[PDB]
Amino acid sequence: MTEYKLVVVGAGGVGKSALTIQLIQNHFVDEYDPTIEDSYRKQVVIDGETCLLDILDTASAMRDQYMRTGEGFLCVFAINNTKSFEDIHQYREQIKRVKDSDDVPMVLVGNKCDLAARTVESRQAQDLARSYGIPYIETSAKTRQGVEDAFYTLVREIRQH
Ligand SMILES: Nc1nc2c(ncn2[C@@H]2O[C@H](COP(=O)(O)OP(=O)(O)O)[C@@H](O)[C@H]2O)c(=O)[nH]1
Ligand SMILES: [Mg+2]
């Protein structure tokens, strides 16, 4: 089967761990240690292909290896965290430097869409993603809305690469 190496990046507290755990365990974690960085594996069928997703949940040699060998990146912010959205540029710049390219498979993810506090509008994020030439997808690690879409879209972006 085909392996896809995915890396989840973004500011502390945006839901990188929650998203990853939702994808694998179909459960929402309230209080996952903010310092645990690890890789997780999930066998899936995506568009009729048996895939192994090798996912690094960032929070170190392991990070360097995945940043270098990672095929695609979820850049996550939370829709109730303006700073995390503003920080996205830094994560994008980092990925471009480590890949020496501005054409890297990536999806911009606006997490916590279940919350009534939104301080980042969908259109602001759409605009940023358009500027980078990538998709924008909103998610909730709590309700599972958008979660498969975000990860599976990242796979469909790697396939175009
Ligand atoms: N309501 C809501 N809370 C979320 C969501 N995703 C994460 N959280 C909460 O946000 C906090 C940070 O999540 P975590 O996954 O640890 O963030 P990380 O630092 O990016 O790994 C925790 O209290 C989570 O329960 C979401 O989609 N909705
Ligand atoms: Mg975490």
Q: Which DSSP category does 113 fall into?
A: T
Structure-determination technique: X-ray
Which resolution in angstroms does this entry have? 1.3
Q: Could you tell which of 9, 17, 58 is best to mutate to test the pocket of ligand 1, judged by most ligand atoms within 8 Å of the CB?
A: 17
Amino acid symbol at 15: G
Q: How far is the CA of 112 from the centre of ligand 1 (A)?
A: 7
Instruction: Tally the C-alpha atoms within 13 A of residue 133's C-alpha that lie toward its C-beta.
Output: 8
| 116 secondary structure, DSSP code | S
Distance CA 18, CA 150 (A): 13
CA 98/CA 114 separation, integer angstroms: 33
Instruction: Tell me how far apart the alpha carbons of residues 6 and 159 are, in angstroms, rounded to a whole number.
Output: 13
DSSP 8-state symbol, 158: H
Name the DSSP letter for residue 32.
Answer: -
Closest residue by Cα to atom 3, ligand 1, is: 112
Q: Which residues, listed in sequence order, are joined to residue 107 by a DSSP beta bridge?
A: 74
Number of C-beta neighbours around residue 36 at 10 A: 9
Nearest ligand to the CA atom of 19: 1
Given a contact cutoff of 8 angstroms between Cβ atoms, the answer to whether 149 and 138 are in contact is no
Contact predicate 31/142, CB 8 Å: no
CB 4 within 8 A of CB 155: yes
Q: Which strands sit side by side in the sheet containing 106-111, from one edge to the other?
A: 38-46, 49-57, 2-9, 72-78, 106-111, 136-138
Q: Please tell me the total count of domains within the chain.
A: 1
Range of the domain at 158: 1-161
> Cα(120)–Cα(84) distance, rounded to whole angstroms?
10
Q: Which of 23, 26, 30 has most ligand 1 atoms within 8 Å of its beta carbon, as the pocket-test mutant?
A: 30
Q: What is the DSSP code string of 45-101?
A: EETTEEEEEEEEE---HHHHHHHHH-SEEEEEEETT-HHHHHHHHHHHHHHHHHHT-
150 close to 19: Cβ distance less than 8 angstroms:
yes
142 and 28 Cβ atoms separated by less than 8 Å:
yes
